[PDB]
Structures are given as structure tokens and as C-alpha cells.
């Protein structure tokens, strides 16, 4: 719509839907377009999403990591699963959230298709390796150690703005 | 459609559908675009909605509270729980309603998906905290004490224009 295009020139990107292939492709295309412009200007990402797919997750994270301009993230309403680690994946010192934000972290969910046990073993090993990669990646982006995440992530956990600031997921809460 | 945009250049925003992620994102993008111009001009929003999700509700509330320009809010026809709290969340002294408008306030309704009892406990505590924050905010924006909100919110409560004005949800009823 017109407001989205108008906000686009302000280097502001919305992530307001579930994470999947199309949304990730659009987001990374926009990131590439912005970095192709003045590489000395920050890029702001406003996150309001309940999560979604996983390959889109990792693709957007890698795109953010590769882009030389610093990318700042702002939580908005809700950030769960994939959205939580996108919000925590911003450059240090530039992670923000609204006073009434609602952040959720939980271990990945999956449904391995039915089949003979060799395929299920392969898929389960891949899921476990994926979970290990995500815990390491979130550990290196936060002050908490790996073991603390081991207790924390086993079930779903919910943090508010102050809770997220104390935990280390975000850096500062927006006030006015 | 053409009248929507034409009214939009006059800093008038409609909220005529159910509250969800897409509508919240669109309306707050409009709010940001409108405040991008001179912040000395008010932003008027007309509410006619049966409510919606609580997360998008809170996102719109926070983005209204963040911007410097004062916000006019006018109820129009009917305003349910989320609509009621948006209407009550306007700048003090400058929130109005129509003579035949209907205002409805009720505690949030939720659907905890089936699962492990620990997951249900976590979701239930989150729902309780969310609701408690809701009446805390509502009592902050109204003149009534928090205990009065607790008593009045346990069931559905329906107020007319004069009833809302007396209750403190509305500062003035426009006649003609």
C-alpha cells in the first residue's frame, strides 16, 4: 500500500506476517536493495510476528549478518520463536522494544513425515543439530551462557520489556 | 478507495475492521507517516470495530502513546473491548463519542490449545498477567479505581454515551 512504499525510503522494513519463503525473499531483497544504496546508513527493522518457518529464519539472519550497514531492530506488540531471534540478532547497542512488548522464546517445533525408521533417524538428527545451532547462535548474541539457555528454553518462556532487557535479548526499552 | 485517502490527507484514520496483525500494522504505519510531518497537528481516529487480538491492540496503543502529537479519538456506532480501550486511550480531555454510540467492555477471551499441563500452566499465567495489565492500564486511563474496574469487568458491561461520559471512558459527547 502507499504507506509501506513511503516508509521504504526511510530505510524502515516491516516484518508483520508469519515467517515463510515469500516474506523472507522479500525481506532479503529489500535488505540487498538498501545496502546497494548508501552503505553508511543504518537500516531499521520493525518486528511484529508470531514466528513461522525455519529456513526463512536462517536466510534472513545470514542476510542481516552479511550486510555491512548496521541493522537495528524494534520489537512491536509481539515477537515469538523466529521473531525473537531476529530481534536479538540486531547489532549490539541497537536493539529496542516498546514498553508493553511481549517476547516469547521456545524450542523449535517440527513434524517428521511418516516413513521407515532410517528416514526418521536422519530427520531427528537434523532437528537436533538445528536446535544445537540455534542455542549456540542465541548464546553468542546474549550475555547468558549456554547452560542458562539449557534450563530456560526447554519449555516456552515469556519475557516483558524489562525482563528482556535484564536477560540480554534487547538493549534498551523505548519510553517516549 | 478514493474517499479513504482523501480523508487521510486531513489526518483522519478509520478503524472499521477487526483488530489483527495486518490492520494494526497498517494503522500504525499511517500514524508514523502522519507524525512524520509537523508534530503540532492532531491526528484524529474514528473507531468502529468489534475488537480483535490483544497483541495488535497493544501495538496500536503503544504507537499512539509514543508520538508527540495529541490524538483525537471518536467512537462511531459501536466499540467493543479492544475498540473500547483504544477509545479510552486517547489524549485526556479530547476524546468524544456520538449520541447513539454503544460502548462495550469485557475481559479478554482466549483459547489455550491443548498440550502438556506445564504448557497450559504457562499460557494461563500469561493470560492472567495480560488481563491484569489490561485493567491496570484501563484504570490508569480512567478516573475509577482499579478495584472498581475489577468488579465491573468480570462480566460484559455495556454503556451508552452518557453512561460512558459519567464512567470516565469518554470526556464529551458531541451533539451537533
Amino acid at each position: 500500500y502507499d504507506p509501506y512504499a513511503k516508509l521504504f525510503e526511510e530505510r524502515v522494513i516491516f516484518l508483520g506476517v508469519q515467517i515463510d519463503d515469500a516474506s523472507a525473499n522479500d525481506v532479503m531483497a529489500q535488505l540487498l536493495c538498501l545496502e546497494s544504496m548508501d552503505p553508511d546508513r543504518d537500516i531499521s527493522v520493525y518486528i511484529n510476528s508470531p514466528g513461522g518457518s525455519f529456513t526463512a529464519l536462517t536466510a534472513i539472519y545470514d542476510t542481516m549478518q552479511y550486510v555491512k550497514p548496521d541493522v537495528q531492530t524494534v520489537c512491536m506488540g509481539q515477537a515469538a520463536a523466529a521473531a525473537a531471534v531476529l530481534l536479538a540478532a540486531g547489532t549490539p547497542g541497537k536493539r529496542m522494544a516498546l514498553p508493553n512488548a511481549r517476547v516469547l522464546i521456545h524450542q523449535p517445533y517440527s513434524e517428521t513425515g511418516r516413513g521407515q525408521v532410517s528416514d526418521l533417524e536422519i530427520a531427528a538428527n537434523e532437528i537436533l543439530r538445528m536446535r544445537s545451532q540455534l542455542e549456540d547462535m542465541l548464546a553468542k548474541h546474549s550475555t547468558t551462557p549456554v547452560e542458562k539457555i539449557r534450563e530456560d528454553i526447554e519449555r516456552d518462556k515469556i519475557l516483558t520489556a524489562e525482563d528482556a532487557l535484564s536477560y540480554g535479548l534487547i538493549d534498551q526499552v523505548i519510553s517516549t | 478507495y478514493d474517499p479513504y485517502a482523501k480523508l487521510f490527507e486531513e489526518r483522519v484514520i478509520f478503524l472499521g475492521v477487526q483488530i489483527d496483525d495486518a490492520s494494526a500494522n497498517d494503522v500504525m504505519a499511517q500514524l508514523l507517516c502522519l507524525e512524520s510531518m509537523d508534530p503540532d497537528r492532531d491526528i484524529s481516529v474514528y473507531i468502529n470495530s468489534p475488537g480483535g487480538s490483544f497483541t495488535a491492540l497493544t501495538a496500536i496503543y503503544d504507537t499512539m502513546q509514543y508520538v508527540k502529537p495529541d490524538v483525537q479519538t471518536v467512537c462511531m456506532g459501536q466499540a467493543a473491548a479492544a475498540a473500547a480501550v483504544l477509545l479510552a486511550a486517547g489524549t485526556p480531555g479530547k476524546r468524544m463519542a456520538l449520541p447513539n454510540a454503544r460502548v462495550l467492555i469485557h475481559q479478554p477471551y482466549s483459547e489455550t490449545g491443548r498440550g502438556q499441563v506445564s504448557d497450559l500452566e504457562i499460557a494461563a499465567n500469561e493470560i492472567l498477567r495480560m488481563r491484569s495489565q489490561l485493567e491496570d492500564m484501563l484504570a490508569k486511563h480512567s478516573t475509577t479505581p482499579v478495584e472498581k474496574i475489577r468488579e465491573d469487568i468480570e462480566r460484559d458491561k455495556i454503556l451508552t454515551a452518557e453512561d460512558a461520559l459519567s464512567y470516565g471512558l469518554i470526556d464529551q459527547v458531541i451533539s451537533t
Binding site: 526511510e10 524502515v12 543504518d42 529496542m96 | -
Partner: peptide, 6 residues
């Protein structure tokens, strides 16, 4: 959201 983002 400026200040300070943008």
C-alpha cells in the same frame, strides 16, 4: 520512532 530509530 525518532529519536532514535530513526
Amino acid at each position: 520512532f525518532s529519536p532514535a530509530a530513526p
